[PDB]
Write a protein that binds this ligand. Structure first.
Ligand SMILES: CC(C)(c1ccc(O)cc1)c1ccc(O)cc1
Ligand SMILES: CC(C)(c1ccc(O)cc1)c1ccc(O)cc1
Lengths: 11, 197, 198, 10
């Protein structure tokens, strides 16, 4: 899974 | 006993992960990759990068691992908490890096190169990832030729430690995944996300 | 069948080990190590070196692995014998080596370097082993400077495939150790000794 | 074990 990683890379 | 030490260690890693990710977004060219490819590289290499930080901090010490500048483990404390094998494997790296006198600047370039050299299974754009790897490799070679010209093959000596780094990172992941399944050590969601990938 | 195919594959490996051992005995300086240290390096590196031989033999092919000149496996026959994951991992090495157009002379130098760089845990004379690793690394750099001067970081590109080589070799050892435990595939004594070593 | 390997290395 990657919910947190994906948000941290987006912001 | 083992529970509080591992909890302390895993809390330290969750804090490092936030910094790892922020740092990686600033690697030249990394953010030009797709988000999927960025996530695949990081999910493959996060532990190699964490272990390089441990090795770097551990260079001033002998037979001790500095997981944080305030959290240092010797052989007996590692044995008390089930980490003796991992402690010994990471020491093997510390030996090689101490002998080569690897510098702070070299650690940061090896972390970035290890990230782009991850060999992940689900890369969408192989050519983009390869081009990033080539640039980061070239950065290291350029640095070594400029800063250590009288040690002709210094880059190669650094590169030759990467198999052991990848091997040790994999067994670290397996060890703490086993801690995860046992359920006695609480873990934060980001660490869990990287660990279960 | 998976029985016969895996039996054939393991027999091929045992026959290549004979060659591997005699080849290692003539690596410059290798025989100056203690017998114990010689055996530690081999028991650590044997699968890495075997897989580099597969990679070299597989370069003329597309999506096939040449385990011997007369034994080639494609995706479907690998799946039939439980080797699909290992086949895809070795093919990822083939991909990089094909792209770099790695030469026969470079494979030999990389096999020797991989042996001396194996990171065994029972080395008696660490500095003798480090000296040998340094010479074999210098042999590869010397070759690359002389033969590929216009590709200045070629050595490094070769070295950067070694983590995947070690990772894939480790996976292969586990898989055939699993086959060993199941007990349906006969295996020769030398292969067994390397597979069970630690 | 290393009985066979030892022998082959002489
Ligand atoms: C992943 C782990 C919890 C860690 C903790 C802190 C850290 O800075 C880096 C890594 C770890 C890995 C390997 C190890 O031997 C101990 C701790
Ligand atoms: C070790 C193994 C039996 C082998 C057989 C033959 C060979 O030349 C090299 C290696 C092998 C390894 C990996 C693999 O995917 C198939 C077979």
């Amino acid at each position: 899974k990657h919910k947190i990683l994906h948000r941290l890379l987006q912001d | 006993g083992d529970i509080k030490a591992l909890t302390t260690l895993c809390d330290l890693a969750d804090r490092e992960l936030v910094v790892i990710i922020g740092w990686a977004k600033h690697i030249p060219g990394f953010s030009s990759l797709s988000l999927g490819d960025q996530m695949s590289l990081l999910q493959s290499a996060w532990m190699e990068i964490l272990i390089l930080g441990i090795v770097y901090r551990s260079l001033p010490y002998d037979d001790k691992l500095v997981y944080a500048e305030d959290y240092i483990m010797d052989e007996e404390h590692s044995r008390l908490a089930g980490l003796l094998e991992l402690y010994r494997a990471i020491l093997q790296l510390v030996r090689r890096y101490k002998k080569l006198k690897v510098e702070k600047e070299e650690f940061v370039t090896l972390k970035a190169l290890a990230l782009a050299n991850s060999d992940s299974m689900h890369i969408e754009d192989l050519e983009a990832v390869q081009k990033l790897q080539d640039l980061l490799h070239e950065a290291l070679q350029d640095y070594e030729l400029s800063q250590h010209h009288e040690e002709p093959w210094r880059t190669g000596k650094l590169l030759l430690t990467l198999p052991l780094l990848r091997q040790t990172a994999a067994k670290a992941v397996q060890h703490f995944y086993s801690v995860k399944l046992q359920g006695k050590v609480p873990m934060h969601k980001l660490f869990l996300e990287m660990l279960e990938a």
